[PDB]
Amino acid sequence: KIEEGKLVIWINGDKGYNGLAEVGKKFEKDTGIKVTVEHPDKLEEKFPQVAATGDGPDIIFWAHDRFGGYAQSGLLAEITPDKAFQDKLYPFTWDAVRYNGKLIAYPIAVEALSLIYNKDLLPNPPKTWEEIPALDKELKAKGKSALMFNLQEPYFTWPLIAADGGYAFKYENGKYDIKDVGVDNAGAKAGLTFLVDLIKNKHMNADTDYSIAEAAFNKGETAMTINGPWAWSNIDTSKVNYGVTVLPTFKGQPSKPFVGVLSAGINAASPNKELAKEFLENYLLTDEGLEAVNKDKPLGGSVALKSYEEELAKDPRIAATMENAQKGEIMPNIPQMSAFWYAVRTAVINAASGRQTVDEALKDAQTRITK
């Protein structure tokens, strides 16, 4: 189920899990408890799978959109900070982790996608999606490409689909209408079609994934990429000269990334929910704990902790991150977010490889989600 006397932590691989072990150590030092940190693949899926059979990690880290689902199947545990603690953190971040009024996780940081470009290849980044194909033309005649980003994860294609009107679930009367989905509206269709046109006019590859795009950009073979703050760490090492800026517009409207709040929740069956409360409120959610994690891999634009946020809000990458977040939308945490991601993942993939037209693909997805 767990062990008792120890703390198992699960974090995704793209995150500062090493800086997280460091806080772990200081914890174990000050305390005496063994703190293990793992980062299994498909963590988001694996969790409930195990958390269910009464076992798994003590603490689970994921963006908040998955938390409502977990809370629903009962795998989480209600947390209980007090006006002392809660006040250290920005209000809207606490709101991101409330499932039916209740707090089911601790908010760490706001994540938003940004346009990352090679200042060597491109000193001036495009202002619009529309000029990318042309840019690619006169980059391709040099064994280079204009852009590559992960097309295998809907999170990365969402900003474009959402720019002209696509939407997940309509928000009405302080609640999401689960039957009013905008994955198959005019806006969503226009965004995807454009994407598909990029592929079909050989400006992009239907297969590009996280690794391929990371490598491509880090190696200097692509002028631009789309990713979050976690990625800066690795780019700092490739030593490519890069800027981080606002995603390009689509049909004159801003790209609208789905904004995630990195959060930490405690397993329903963690025998040491006490140890967990200690480590999360006392060691990690501190200027010192956040600095440890951040130095490993950038946390994001805005951190939940108001005082730490007092120092990291000056960087031009952080700033662009805050700009894109601003134009974006905080994700819902409702349990149906999982069906949404699954249906959308299939749609883009099917449309992009040509097994389905944009129309068939998005209709399928819309059906799947409201069924």
Ligand SMILES: OC[C@H]1O[C@H](O[C@H]2[C@H](O)[C@@H](O)[C@H](O)O[C@@H]2CO)[C@H](O)[C@@H](O)[C@@H]1O
């Ligand atoms: O691609 C759908 C998934 O999108 C988000 O996942 C993000 C996550 O928020 C981010 O912190 C981690 O870096 O990148 C993944 C994208 O691969 C949602 O949080 C997931 O629930 C969705 O499945």
